[PDB]
C-alpha cells in the first residue's frame, strides 16, 4: 500500500501544540493553528511526490443574478439571514443586504488586474484588494 | 469591465477588525480571522454570479523525489533550513530533516482506508489520522 494519492481530511490530531512548541512556534500562532481543520492533498506519480497542506477557517459560497432580490444566509461569517439585492451602478457591483444590521452591503469592481472590494456595516468600511492568481 | 471571472487571492485588508465588531463577532473569532488570507473564485455568466470564498491561515507545499536529498526552507512554520531526504521503509514513507532540531522528520503510511501521519521533533510526537475524500 504505497499509493497515497487523494484528498485527505483530518480526523484526529494528537499532541499538536506540544509538537509546535518543540519547533519554537510562538504562542499566538499555536493557539490559532490548534483551532482550524486540515486538508492534505497528495499527488503521487511513481517516486515523485507533491504535498499541499491547507489550514482553512471558514468557507463561503453564494450564487445570484443582478437585479433579483434574494434571501441569503451569511454562512460562517456571522450566520445571519438577510435579503440581498446586487445591482450595477456603472460597472461597480453593488449589493445591499436587508436585515437586523444597519447599512450593510458591499461594492465590487475591477481596475487593471485587481479586484476592489469594500464591505460596509454601520460606520465601519473594510477595504480589501485582490490579485488574480 | 463587468467581467469578474477568475480566482482572486487577497493582498491587502484594512479595517477588517472594526468591520467585524460591527457584526458582533466574538474576539476569539476576530483574532483568528485578521490573520488568514482569502481566496475568492468568481464564476460569472453575464449577470448570473457564483462566488466561492476560502480563508486560509498558512500553506505548506512540498515536492520531492523519494531517495534524492532536497533543501527545504520551512517558511510557513518555523522558518528554518533543513536538508531533507525521504525513503521507503516497506509501506512507511519516512522523512528526515537534517538541521538544528534533533530527530526532526515525519512518517506517513496507509492503514485500511486511512492515512497516518506522525510528525516528530526531538521528544514530541504529533500523531494525525486522515480519511480519504
Ligand atoms: C507528509 C506530510 C507532512 C510533511 C505534513 C506536514 C504538515 C504540518 C507539519 C503542519 C503544519 C501546520 C502548522 C505547524 C501550523 C499551521 C499550518 C500547518 C497546518 C501547515
Curated annotation (Swiss-Prot), chains A, B:
Keyword terms: Cytoplasm, Retinol-binding, Transport, Vitamin A
Highest taxon of source: Eukaryota
GO biological process entries: epidermis development; fatty acid transport; vitamin A metabolic process
Disulfide pattern: none
Tissue distribution of the protein: Higher expression in adult small intestine and to a much lesser extent in fetal kidney.
CDD domains the record matches: CRBP2 (cd19463)
Single Gene Ontology MF annotation: molecular carrier activity
GO CC terms, sorted: cytosol; nucleus
Subcellular compartments: Cytoplasm
Family classification: Belongs to the calycin superfamily. Fatty-acid binding protein (FABP) family.
Comment, domains: Forms a beta-barrel structure that accommodates hydrophobic ligands in its interior.
Functional summary from the UniProt entry: Intracellular transport of retinol.
Protein name: Retinol-binding protein 2
Taxonomic source organism: Homo sapiens (Human)
Amino acid at each position: 500500500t504505497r499509493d497515497q494519492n487523494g484528498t485527505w481530511e483530518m480526523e484526529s490530531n494528537e499532541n499538536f501544540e506540544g509538537y509546535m512548541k518543540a519547533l519554537d512556534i510562538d504562542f499566538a500562532t499555536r493557539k490559532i493553528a490548534v483551532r482550524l481543520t486540515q486538508t492534505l492533498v497528495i499527488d503521487q506519480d511513481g517516486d515523485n511526490f507533491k504535498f499541499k497542506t491547507t489550514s482553512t477557517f471558514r468557507n463561503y459560497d453564494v450564487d445570484f443574478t443582478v437585479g433579483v432580490e434574494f434571501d441569503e444566509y451569511t454562512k460562517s461569517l456571522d450566520n445571519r439571514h438577510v435579503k440581498a439585492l446586487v445591482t450595477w451602478e456603472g460597472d461597480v457591483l453593488v449589493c445591499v443586504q436587508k436585515g437586523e444590521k444597519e447599512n450593510r452591503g458591499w461594492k465590487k469592481w475591477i481596475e487593471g488586474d485587481k479586484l476592489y472590494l469594500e464591505l460596509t456595516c454601520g460606520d465601519q468600511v473594510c477595504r480589501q484588494v485582490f490579485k488574480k492568481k
